[PDB]
Design a protein around this motif. Structure first.
Motif, mmCIF file in Angstrom:
data_model
loop_
_atom_site.group_PDB
_atom_site.id
_atom_site.type_symbol
_atom_site.label_atom_id
_atom_site.label_comp_id
_atom_site.label_asym_id
_atom_site.label_seq_id
_atom_site.Cartn_x
_atom_site.Cartn_y
_atom_site.Cartn_z
ATOM 1 N N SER A 409 -11.507 62.800 65.058
ATOM 2 C CA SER A 409 -12.909 62.980 64.716
ATOM 3 C C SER A 409 -13.022 64.162 63.764
ATOM 4 N N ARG A 410 -14.134 64.189 63.018
ATOM 5 C CA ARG A 410 -14.460 65.200 62.006
ATOM 6 C C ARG A 410 -13.736 64.893 60.700
ATOM 7 N N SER A 411 -14.494 64.660 59.625
ATOM 8 C CA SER A 411 -13.853 64.065 58.459
ATOM 9 C C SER A 411 -13.035 65.057 57.643
ATOM 10 N N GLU A 412 -13.094 66.368 57.928
ATOM 11 C CA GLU A 412 -12.074 67.229 57.342
ATOM 12 C C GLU A 412 -10.693 66.896 57.898
#
Lengths: 450, 447
Positions: A409-412
């Motif tokens: 999760s989290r697009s970084e």
């Protein structure tokens, strides 16, 4: 000239934590551009200096206007007119221009932004994927077939986690997959099974900085048990399909007064007895050994303190024939320190953090030092990341076969995985996901492989 | 030829929650490429595989195949700058009113990737291409977006007892995008420190905000005002508040009452006192805008309560922005009914609710003609794709809703807005409080 640098500038952007970081844009005379952003860790000692403004009235002291100004007024005029494909010469120029071993004058975050943006501009001007440009122009490797990365963080503990577990990162590693898309299927499904497990246990499923969980667990074994269950619930075999990697971050709880590994968070919370869990080096190695026998643990990062080189060498002798022993803060991606690690056989793996050393050229030097030693190179994110996906192309270009770039999760984090999917698709039969054969630094036990 | 589509393919990628979504890559005869990815939240159909062996049934391989096997062969050879024709063709290729056959996620991925490819081939920024080629606006000066940033969560997918869905700060006092994000960044960090001091969880919800175990909406609003002041700013004149009530989630169609179910189930709220008629709900929202510097309310009443929405817009809408989100679902036909009934004075624009760029621009222009604002919005499942930043700048909406100050599927949009502002120099203006053309804010609030 197709590669002549025409303009170069930096400006302040934000990382995945909402802190300022540096972006740099390089424009070539052909009009092609390259752009890069610099990540940031949660501050090491041997790391190249990340330059912050330290103004309490601006971004709680974390502004990077001085690093940005160093690009715009100090570095940029020196690089205008240079051929952007001359990566080593451009990095050397910035290294000499800063003039300090740790890049404290210009800032590693100024230098790295330019270092990466120049390579991206050159790759654009050569009309080629970044990983091919890095492999065949920068590193001169003449590759047509590339190795994809086995990814390794779903449960957090340690210094920046809300719970009482002392180890820092508990990671899954889908070694049983035979493609990048199947590896990310395994990882996505296991991550979502783990989320369901935690939710029904009444634990918090909000995300830590790297997109994993920081639930209120009492023991490392409780986290490891839950990961084994998530792997099974998703339909996979622990070990043979999905293994476990640890980032112990032992420097964080090494008691320098007593030379013992003191599990301070579990002790303070009254989970752990303070004498039973104040460990000698020998007892800490025996404990890590035990965990590798109770759980499908294939990799241990910073299992002992950076101050405990003798213990690190003993750990690599005891466990490293079949278990990956990763040095992170031991080396800080510093080629000079990695060479000393190679001589002493301190680890069999190095964690590669671009912004710990500060140029692409020096990072490649560290990678090649590890290659010569038959160490693995785990290309790594930082806890503060950006949408920049450079480390995906770097890991593929150098065929390291391993990457550490966050949870599902989290697009970084996800952006690196999406970039790896795209690289695999672009290459077709010229991309190989090696799975368990990705290791050249260890011989994994057959009982663990299956 | 420069804009002729040469190749076009889709493949499965992951959104910011770790669930599959669609990526599309368009390559032109000239060698230029565009790439887009589709977010995920009366909406156009998002097509999921439903295979229990794969991604807990949430794969998008059918959508991906629809692009590769059905859409791609029909678009080869077409002019990528003819956005309206390409979108119309995909709509007819699907043949259903809600894109149920090919999937809105298949169609939108192509729609966006075509425009980005054409912008690349024109050697122009995406926001300039969208403004001057797609929308034909002949613009050289652009308005930057006042962000509304979701810092505290409640409602359906937050693990607390708050019924309202999103609590947002809005840095209307800034005079630049970079100053706006300085205010947002510093306020977000101040809020984080305040939550830790109160023993509340500071790990992040899906949109980068916090989801702490709070009991009342007033508690969240109290903390946000305190964080604004702790960051050194003035609530109201510097940083105002926006709400996404998401009232449809707790409207009881049987009793026609707004039942604050999460607070009632948690024994925080008495069920009689917090089962509100439309008039009591409006009265509650009004009181909130008097106690707190709230400038904007989204979905304050249910999508099944158009009469209520009209009354709310007539009661507060002179000086408070009233945003229709699920009331319209970015559907131009439904937006036109909102205009005629004066249901709202603003529309939330979600590209994947309608499924093509052309229809999205149609919705935007319907709102522009009614003197509504358009808030270009993310979805809770986002990607690193920054299309909405360029779309909001191209349409000069002056407003965007694209997440908190953490998680780079949100931050990437803010970073792109910073880059746009730097690129445009004096041709970019952040209007701050003057960004509102649909309302006249109270001088007491903005002074």
């Amino acid at each position: 000239d197709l590669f002549k640098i025409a303009d170069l500038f930096a400006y302040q952007v934000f990382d995945s934590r909402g802190f300022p970081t540096v972006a740099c844009v390089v424009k070539l005379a052909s009009g092609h551009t390259g752009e890069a952003m610099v990540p940031s860790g949660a501050t090491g000692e041997k790391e190249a200096i990340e330059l912050r403004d330290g103004d309490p009235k601006a971004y709680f002291g974390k502004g990077v206007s001085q690093a940005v100004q160093n690009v715009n007024q100090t570095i940029a005029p020196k690089l205008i007119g240079l051929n952007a494909t001359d990566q080593a010469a451009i990095d050397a120029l910035m290294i000499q221009l800063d003039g300090t071993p740790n890049k404290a004058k210009l800032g590693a975050n100024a230098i790295l932004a330019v270092s990466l943006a120049v390579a991206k501009a050159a790759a654009s001007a050569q009309k080629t994927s970044l990983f091919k440009y890095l492999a065949n122009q920068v590193m001169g490797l003449n590759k047509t077939e590339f190795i994809l990365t086995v990814p390794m963080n779903v449960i957090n503990g340690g210094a920046h986690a809300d719970n009482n577990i002392d180890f820092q990162e508990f990671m899954i590693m889908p070694l049983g997959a035979n493609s990048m898309h199947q590896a990310l299927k395994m990882a996505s499904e296991t991550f979502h099974a783990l989320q369901k497990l935690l939710k029904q246990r009444g634990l918090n499923t909000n995300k830590g900085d790297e997109g994993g969980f920081a639930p209120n667990l009492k023991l490392a074994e409780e986290a490891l048990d839950l990961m084994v269950e998530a792997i099974k619930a998703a339909g996979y075999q622990p070990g043979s399909d999905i293994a476990i990697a640890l980032d112990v971050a032992a420097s964080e709880f090494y008691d320098d007064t007593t030379k013992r590994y003191v599990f301070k968070k579990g002790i303070k919370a009254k989970i752990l007895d303070e004498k039973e869990w104040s460990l000698t080096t020998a007892q800490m190695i025996a404990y890590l050994k035990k965990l590798t026998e109770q759980y499908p643990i294939i990799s241990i990062e910073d299992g002992l303190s950076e101050h405990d080189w003798e213990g690190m060498e003993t750990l690599t002798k005891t466990l490293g024939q079949h278990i990956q022993i990763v040095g992170d803060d031991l080396y800080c991606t510093n080629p000079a320190i990695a060479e000393k690690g190679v001589a002493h056989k301190a680890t069999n793996s190095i964690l590669i953090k671009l912004n710990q050393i500060g140029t692409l050229t020096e990072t490649i030097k560290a990678i090649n030092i590890a290659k010569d030693a038959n160490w693995s190179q785990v290309i790594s994110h930082r806890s503060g990341e950006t949408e920049d996906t450079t480390i995906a192309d770097l890991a593929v270009a150098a065929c390291t076969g391993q990457i550490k770039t966050g949870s599902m999760s989290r697009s970084e984090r996800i952006a690196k995985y999406n970039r790896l999917l795209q690289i695999e698709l672009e290459l077709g039969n010229n991309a190989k996901y090696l799975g368990w054969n990705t290791f050249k630094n260890i011989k994994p036990q057959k009982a663990l492989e299956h």
